[PDB]
């Protein structure tokens, strides 16, 4: 609990200053949100990755020269359903780090504040909220350790890989050699396997 409290205090004291100060800085760049999966089960689908984040650039549907949604708009639940229906892969959204405002952040880049359900107003202390949000789970889950009874939370390591669904195979950033048996033997440290449908 002491380590968790120290981490929380350090986060609060480092990120105490920034507050919303402006409505729209006017920039264009942003980071690219893509869905994340861990071995066959989508932990975070694309819907909640950009739920409440304003679009940066080129969010057009997979149809050439036609735009599904205009620029600099906030994604509601119906907007997210529209994205899911057309199955958009990844979207570029503007974030807090790539903002041009001085001594603070503007309302649009931060996006929707999760407590209220709409876009963030002016004068809300983002930094303290972020620090508390990052700090609470560590100390809470540390305190809740003895509930399980001290049993080891060890999951058996997987010796092999079996694909859940049928699809084409794909190898990304792979350097390999062929042994006598002919099986592809991986010789690169960061070889990744991605399963792609038809």
């Amino acid at each position: 609990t002491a380590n968790s409290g120290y981490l929380t205090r350090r986060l609060v004291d480092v990120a105490q200053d920034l507050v919303v100060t402006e409505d729209d800085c006017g920039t264009h760049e942003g980071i690219m949100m893509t869905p994340v999966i861990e071995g066959g089960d989508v932990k975070e689908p694309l819907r909640d990755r950009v739920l409440g984040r304003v679009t940066a650039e080129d969010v057009l549907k997979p149809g050439t020269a036609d735009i599904l949604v205009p620029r600099n708009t906030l994604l509601h639940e119906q907007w997210c359903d529209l994205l899911e229906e057309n199955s958009v892969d990844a979207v570029k959204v503007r974030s807090v780090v790539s903002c041009d405002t001085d001594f603070g952040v503007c309302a649009h880049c931060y996006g929707r504040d999760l407590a209220r359900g709409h876009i963030i107003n002016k004068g809300e202390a983002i930094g303290v909220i972020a620090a508390q949000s990052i700090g609470e789970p560590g100390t809470q889950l540390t305190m809740r350790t003895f509930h399980i009874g001290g049993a080891a939370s060890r999951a058996a390591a997987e010796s092999s890989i079996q694909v859940k669904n049928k699809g084409s195979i794909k190898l990304s950033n792979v350097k390999s050699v062929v042994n006598s048996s002919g099986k592809l033997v991986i010789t690169s440290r960061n070889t990744e396997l991605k399963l792609i449908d038809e």
């Binding site: 209220r116 107003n121 002016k122 004068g123 809300e124």
Partner: protein, 74 residues
Amino acid sequence: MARVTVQDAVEKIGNRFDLVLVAARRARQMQVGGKDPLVPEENDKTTVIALREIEEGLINNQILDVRERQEQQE
């Protein structure tokens, strides 16, 4: 209704942090000054009368500023 939730009260203003309108001027001039409440009191304490007034739509920053200007002249 108004005692439980102020969502309708803030819908007219549009900013939750702009409660300075409700408290700093309306409730104060009701409590200390001789200003009479608009809506019936219903035995409610002050600061709930004002919230009801903004909820219905009689009190807003422009209206209070205009009224202040009216009592500025003599």
